[PDB]
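Final report, results section. Input specification for complex C-07:
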Amino acid sequence: MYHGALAQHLDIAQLVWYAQWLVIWTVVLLYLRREDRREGYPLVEELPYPKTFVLPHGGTVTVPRRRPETRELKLAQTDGFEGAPLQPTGNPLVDAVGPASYAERAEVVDATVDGKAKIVPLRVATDFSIAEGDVDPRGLPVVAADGVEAGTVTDLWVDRSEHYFRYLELSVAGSARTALIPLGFCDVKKDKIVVTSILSEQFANVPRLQSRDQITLREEDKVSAYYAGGLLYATPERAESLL
Amino acid sequence: CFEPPPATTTQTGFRGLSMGEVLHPATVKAKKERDAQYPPALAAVKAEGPPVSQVYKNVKVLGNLTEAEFLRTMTAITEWVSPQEGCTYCHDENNLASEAKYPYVVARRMLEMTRAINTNWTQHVAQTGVTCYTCHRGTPLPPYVRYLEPTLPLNNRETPTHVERVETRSGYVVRLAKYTAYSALNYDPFTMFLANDKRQVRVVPQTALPLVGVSRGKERRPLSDAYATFALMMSISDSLGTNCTFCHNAQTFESWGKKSTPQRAIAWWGIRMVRDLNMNYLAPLNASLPASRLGRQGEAPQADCRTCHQGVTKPLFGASRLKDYPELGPIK
Amino acid sequence: ALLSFERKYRVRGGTLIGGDLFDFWVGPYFVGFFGVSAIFFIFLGVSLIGYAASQGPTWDPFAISINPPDLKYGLGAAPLLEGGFWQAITVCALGAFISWMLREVEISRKLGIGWHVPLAFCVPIFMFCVLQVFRPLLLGSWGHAFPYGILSHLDWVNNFGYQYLNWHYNPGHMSSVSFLFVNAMALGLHGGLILSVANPGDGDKVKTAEHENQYFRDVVGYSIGALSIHRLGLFLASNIFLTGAFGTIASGPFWTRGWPEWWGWWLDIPFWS
Amino acid sequence: ADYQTIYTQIQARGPHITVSGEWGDNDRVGKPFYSYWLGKIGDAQIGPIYLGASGIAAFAFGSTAILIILFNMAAEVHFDPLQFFRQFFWLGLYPPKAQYGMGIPPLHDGGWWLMAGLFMTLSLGSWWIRVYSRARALGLGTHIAWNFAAAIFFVLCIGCIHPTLVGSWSEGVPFGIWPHIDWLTAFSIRYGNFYYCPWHGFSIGFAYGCGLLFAAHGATILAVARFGGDREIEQITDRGTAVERAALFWRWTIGFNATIESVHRWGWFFSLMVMVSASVGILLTGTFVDNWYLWCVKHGAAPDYPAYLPATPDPASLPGAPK
Ligand code: BCB
Ligand code: BCB
Ligand code: BCB
Ligand SMILES: C/C=C1\c2cc3[nH]c4c(c3C)C(=O)[C@H](C(=O)OC)c4c3nc(cc4[nH]c(cc(n2)[C@@H]1C)c(C(C)=O)c4C)[C@@H](C)[C@@H]3CCC(=O)OC/C=C(\C)CCC[C@H](C)CCC[C@H](C)CCCC(C)C
Ligand SMILES: CC(C)=CCC/C(C)=C/CC/C(C)=C/CC/C(C)=C/CC/C(C)=C/CC/C(C)=C/CC/C(C)=C/CC1=C(C)C(=O)c2ccccc2C1=O
Ligand code: HEM
Ligand code: HEM
Ligand code: HEM
Ligand SMILES: CC(C)=CCC/C(C)=C/C=C/C(C)=C/C=C/C(C)=C/C=C\C=C(C)\C=C\C=C(/C)CC/C=C(\C)CCCC(C)C
Ligand SMILES: [Fe+2]
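Structure output:
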């Protein structure tokens, strides 16, 4: 007589082994993979009940999203194949195609817990200041990928929810306008601001703000994607093979 | 801190199992040069003459041998036991028959012991066998001896520190871990396994499922038995300068056959031999040895794994003096 | 065939070598030059695995095992059925891992994103090299490495772990385990926190990033942040093998005794011995 | 390459934010101080910290649990403070040595061990309330509490549950650095190699899986940090280019993709199953399985190797061999 020895040559440890592979594949295939499908569907070129989230500052938004107007893509196919790559028809930086593509986000300024505009410059965020030890970029030139001074940083844009700098505001030389850039595209020096993403002649076409003192989520995508396009589209050599 | 490359490794299992010894070429060569100090065999003597039973006054074991062989034996015995003092360590200078000193009566019991190992315990010692030197190494007190409690250092020739001394209770774990090869196993494998046949080493069941009547409550053996088995094996592995793979496929330590090497069987006969020597031979001599040689609980120093091996899988690297001295076993 | 946003991202460029020739998609999969080599490495490997398995004793997945050569062969060429099969799968495996990484480099360049993912995959490749190539090289044979089997490679770790008495005591293993536990714990904390804010339950409002920072300040007192958690998460995950690579390599070429015995730089210091 | 992902090049400072909860807004203690070097790799602010009726009690039960073991560690080194610091790692509190069953172990043999574990249970139990109530006070989900509950569920399986099933308090985990390390070998020996337990195999798969997930996800979010991939809350409700590029990397790599929120469910479920599968293993260990190797031999899962060195029969089964 053995502890766990039931009928046949089977044991309790054998039965649970099946029940283990039962619950796992159930959670994996009938739940986890279904939740993986709440964004990016249906298939262009098994589905779950579209989930609802009550927003922090009044209202709701359902995933996945359906917009009232479509964005035409200025691209043309390279060949007649289905998985064939696409080629930019003009300037990919302004048309926003490929690595320059921004998502179809809402045109509202991000908000803190207390409602206030999250991403604001130090002129709107007066109580915020730079920590002792790091460089103050206000008054330092911005040298582009080709080694040319594209402009000068005038102010800093801070996230009022996490206490973390995100953007650098610089007035473009020979443009009289101000252009934003995510800190990820910058190498902080004490005398200069190093940007290898785009050319100096391409600092003028950086997506323009609707307001000087506030930024919306869609505008935060337009700017961030613009410099990401330059990684592959700044010089006619950044598109072809390295070797 | 680190043992410089390269390292000598062997294969004890099927390729890809990573079974085999992991050895340092400097450590082993330091061990061979210590073991090579083995005194060579004495010159061949005359076999013609009357046995020493008729010749001498007090001989009860080696009585069949000739006077030429008996003196040779005693000359060899001195070279392995007490060479720093000589004949007079166990004898009175004027009287070689009298048993006035303590190292005489112990020696005669040790003779019947040494003969027994090379006659009866040949499954372990084989044609290699053992002599007086294998443990004593030219000293009256064997370097590696065990009491009823863990002591430091392992080699008793070394001068101990205050904490390492058995008197200071602050360094008990220090004496406890070093015998179990630097492991915090709170179990002495000598007093529970190596001293007597009271405890079973094997703790792993031979059934895939727990039998009803042994696996519930007080019916069960405590987990402490699995700890102590592991504590014993550590003492075993460190004493032979090797690891588990030398005798086990780590896949299953309990199973024999392809999972066990031919050395694991020898090791098993090693456990059964050590106990017989401890109980029948190395336990009743506490009245024969002085109060200075005794431990704390009135016990005589007893042997284990390292007593002959001293850090090698074979004691003295396969050195045999069995044919050279037939008077130490096997006995016809 | 594509996601509701995929079309605009599917563009030419990003390949290291091959150019426009290999730049396209097979279903959802991207290829590239290293997609061709990878598949080749995967194909030739599994083919030789399917060739070695029919030469074996059984067909049970748990029991299927292909083993390295004997230790007496050294680092020379071994017979096909005597560890030679294993010698070919290793190179095929390595090539498949190397090409898969560089394929992910070809994907990251196309999306205009960071190179963090394919650089994180260099760690498990690096650890695979320590076990299969690096440590065997210092010893002098290909036989020290693990076999390719579902249950058989567990017995390799078993013996190799037991070869130095106790493997838990290994300093490189200790920190290796330390980072394995601290990374899994953090993923349970991070994965749970993101779901807690997004899903408060019933008809309650989704909270803010200040609620993220408030929770841990109330539970443990210190929060790392929203960006820094993914930095440390990558850090705690990488340092499982980073510290583990030094525990494995020392066992043998740099240490022959047991790993509990390695703790003899602390206990046997003359002033407290 | 991004430098912000490596370290914070420019750190931001301001007045601290206090989110009001349902209860206990005055229980926050500690004047906030800021570190510059910690701000490079994380957040500069350290403090404040909440106590509450669930936090202090856990420290009260925790300290008592630790005081028992530390007093038992000092008794092994005979009150010697110099030998306490030297042998600290080897020191520990042990379960009952002899077999007694399920009665209360004697003070000197597993008695203090049972008490230290009892104050341990109430310490982890009161801390779970702290993990649970804080989320309920701030209007969040109880996901973290449930992941903590499964973690607590595994500790008691190797703490009190397994000893209750078999009927022996000696089965438990000793306290200490090396003593608890020694248990992992002693428990793997008794039940015939823990490699052949499928649930040990599952838990390892999830323990490794959490390593793979965090090395992937952690690197993935850092790769899209230039787009705002760190702001995950605003990426779930409003799909941004950050999570669009994050999902399309894996789709072109492996064939399929998760979402921004669902991949956190992947990381949570994997974390959960490190404790769930581990608990089921220990529950079967001792109660329904005596040997885990022979179980894989009984079902034929276990593999077999040829004998390099001559096959070695058991010398105990020989006719006339000593017991
Ligand atoms: C006898 C048993 C001991 C032992 C023996 C041991 C050894 C010998 C070694 C470890 C090592 C390690 N052990 Mg340890 N161990 C560990 C955990 C660990 C890890 C932290 C660490 C590193 C693992 C590794 O190197 O993976 C390596 C993973 C690799 C190489 C994966 C490669 C990935 C590859 C590139 C991708 C694969 C692609 C596929 C082919 C594609 C599949 C696609 C499919 C879906 C179609 C825990 C948590 C415990 C506990 C709880 O006690 C423990 C106890 C023990 N270990 C016992 C004491 N352990 C290792 C270490 O570093 O420590 C020093 C190590 O070498
Ligand atoms: C000390 C470290 C070693 C170790 C010790 C170890 C232990 C102790 C345990 C495992 C387990 C596992 N190991 Mg393993 N291991 C494996 C394979 C495996 C998996 C079958 C399994 C799950 C691990 C996991 O979830 O990972 C994360 C990956 C995930 C989640 C993706 C799914 C991958 C899938 C599980 C792997 C399937 C492999 C197939 C056999 C396919 C083979 C390729 C084909 C095409 C030829 C591979 C392929 C490698 C490589 C490439 O190096 C490796 C490295 C090591 N393992 C180190 C050498 N491993 C567990 C097991 O269940 O074994 C029975 C287990 O308990
Ligand atoms: C001889 C050694 C074997 C062994 C013995 C072993 C045992 C006995 C057990 C495991 C278990 C496990 N082993 Mg294994 N093991 C593992 C890894 C693992 C884990 C996946 C799994 C669970 C460990 C865990 O997460 O607990 C670490 C996490 C813990 C303990 C949670 C702690 C959280 C806690 C609530 C917080 C407490 C801290 C507080 C601050 C302190 C407060 C207390 C105060 C009051 C005093 C690997 C990767 C390997 C390899 C590479 O071979 C391996 C090989 C071995 N293990 C050898 C074969 N292993 C466990 C398992 O899965 O069960 C079947 C298990 O029970
Ligand atoms: C910090 C380190 C952590 C980490 C991190 C990351 N991990 C990553 C990435 C990051 C970032 C990705 O970029 C990449 C990926 O795509 O995302 C899923 C990946 C991947 N990690 C995989 C497995 C994995 N991760 C493990 C561990 C950790 N991951 C640790 C914790 C382990 C363990 C523990 O064993 C395993 C088995 C694959 C799923 C995938 C490789 C795909 C490949 O390279 O395809 C190409 C190769 C194949 C399709 C197979 C090739 C066929 C050969 C010729 C035949 C096989 C021979 C084989 C050697 C025989 C052995 C079998 C035997 C033992 C039974
Ligand atoms: C058809 C063909 C051969 C064409 C040729 C082209 C070619 C080379 C094809 C390759 C074919 C091959 C070999 C395919 C196999 C690919 C592999 C290795 C698949 C392994 C599948 C397994 C078992 C994965 C387990 C890992 C796991 C738990 C995944 C689930 C969680 C996911 C999806 C994580 C990925 C993921 C992460 C990590 C995010 O951070 C993130 C952030 C924001 C949005 C989405 C995501 C996201 O999806
Ligand atoms: C080379 C130096 C030695 C010589 C020449 C020598 C000589 C002798 C002689 C002549 C006898 C027999 C006395 C008699 O009864 O008439 C004897 C007996 C004995 N001596 Fe020695 N002895 C020597 C060293 C030792 C040593 C070192 C030991 C102990 C290790 C020892 C122990 C014994 C024993 C046990 C007997 C009894 C004989 C027996 O029954 O086997 N002797 N010795
Ligand atoms: C420290 C490393 C070692 C470990 C962890 C280990 C493991 C084990 C375990 C767990 C058992 C008991 C299994 C059962 O219930 O049957 C065992 C038995 C045994 N092992 Fe080892 N082993 C080690 C090293 C060695 C070495 C070096 C030898 C050879 C000198 C050896 C020889 C034996 C023998 C003879 C037995 C049978 C015990 C008896 O019946 O008396 N082991 N081993
Ligand atoms: C329980 C304690 C002991 C264990 C487990 C043990 C284990 C072993 C093992 C595994 C071997 C095989 C080595 C090989 O052939 O490569 C061996 C050989 C040997 N042992 Fe021991 N040993 C122990 C104590 C002793 C003692 C007390 C003696 C003295 C009587 C001794 C004398 C020898 C000799 C002379 C050999 C070599 C015989 C041969 O050629 O195989 N050992 N021992
Ligand atoms: C009938 C009733 C009364 C009985 C049932 C009671 C019950 C539920 C019992 C269950 C007992 C349990 C859960 C036992 C579990 C024990 C376990 C899993 C122990 C595991 C590990 C223990 C470890 C790693 C030991 C840790 C100890 C130390 C690190 C030592 C000292 C502590 C420190 C150095 C930290 C102090 C911090 C200092 C810097 C201020
Ligand atoms: Fe995340």
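Chain B touches chain D through 65 residues (CB under 8 Å). The CA atoms of residues 113 and 281 of chain B lie 7 Å apart. This concludes the modelling results for the funded period.
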